[PDB]
Amino acid sequence: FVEMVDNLRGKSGQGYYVEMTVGSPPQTLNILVDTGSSNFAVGAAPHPFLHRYYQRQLSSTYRDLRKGVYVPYTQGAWAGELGTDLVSIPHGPNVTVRANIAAITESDKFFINGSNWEGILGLAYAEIARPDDSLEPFFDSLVKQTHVPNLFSLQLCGAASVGGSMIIGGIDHSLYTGSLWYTPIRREWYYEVIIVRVEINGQDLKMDCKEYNYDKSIVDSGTTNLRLPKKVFEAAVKSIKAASSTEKFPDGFWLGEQLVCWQAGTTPWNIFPVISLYLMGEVTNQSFRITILPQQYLRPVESQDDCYKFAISQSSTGTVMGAVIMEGFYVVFDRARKRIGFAVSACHVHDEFRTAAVEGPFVTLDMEDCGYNI
């Protein structure tokens, strides 16, 4: 794994990408790591925001599946041509696999100017692949064609340069401290988990736990924010407001439309509360909690000022534990054991007084009832 450490790069707020190669001879591309979808896709035609792109005609091993595909996301969408080719990860396992590849030929609000990635690696399950579950996702193909164990882990390191590690096939202990706590994957489609309690600076939000998972809760490396179901978002904002008493912020700030700025070096983190999500544990009536700091949910936007955007936002399609959550943690996607592990990240941003945390056990009854049905 030492050869996989620090294999992720990016621009703050623009996405974490791994270098991959496709075709013959190898065409090097930067690919966004996305646990929130299941399609492997690459820019395959010129676009204002692409420095490079997949040239199918230059790959001797490219196969045209002669079928189109369309993939819509919460933010953006693209359409393209299905096909297959040979795929390797330079700073990952030493192997070449054949995999499905969507060559993106049309897109809207998908590519991000200056982000330095040209494609996306959907790491979730076949069930949500487009056009349908018969289009084998990359990680399934990797596992089937090699001896790479059915597991990967992500360490996303926040901030304007960003970095981290995608450890393919294992867990690198130098990337975390303390204990790993596991939560079951409720269902193999997205990486769906179950949130059983929410606290803001130790104050219970006091909602029925089903609200926290309406209509699902997912772990998504390809989404910036912590996105909460509308009802939960409103309650969270009210509680966060109350907690941050010494300062009043405009409505626009809480909607992510206005930045808050302070003299460089004087950000009063102490004003804002920590936020804890309790997750269903692997043992009956047992939960654990992960706690994030405002250094996670107030994201720096790029003079002599530090400006931040509030990065907790509303969702119409359930909770999304995005980069805001993941940057505090080393996260183990244990597909073999149908579970997601969390530990305190060795690289998370914090201060001399508070730290991101993973702690348990806590007693929580009837946790299974916290799941929403359908």
């Binding site: 929130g36 979808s37 949500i128 489609w189 399609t317």
Partner: peptide
């Protein structure tokens, strides 16, 4: 990143 399901 998927919308729909």
């Amino acid at each position: 990143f998927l919308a729909x399901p």
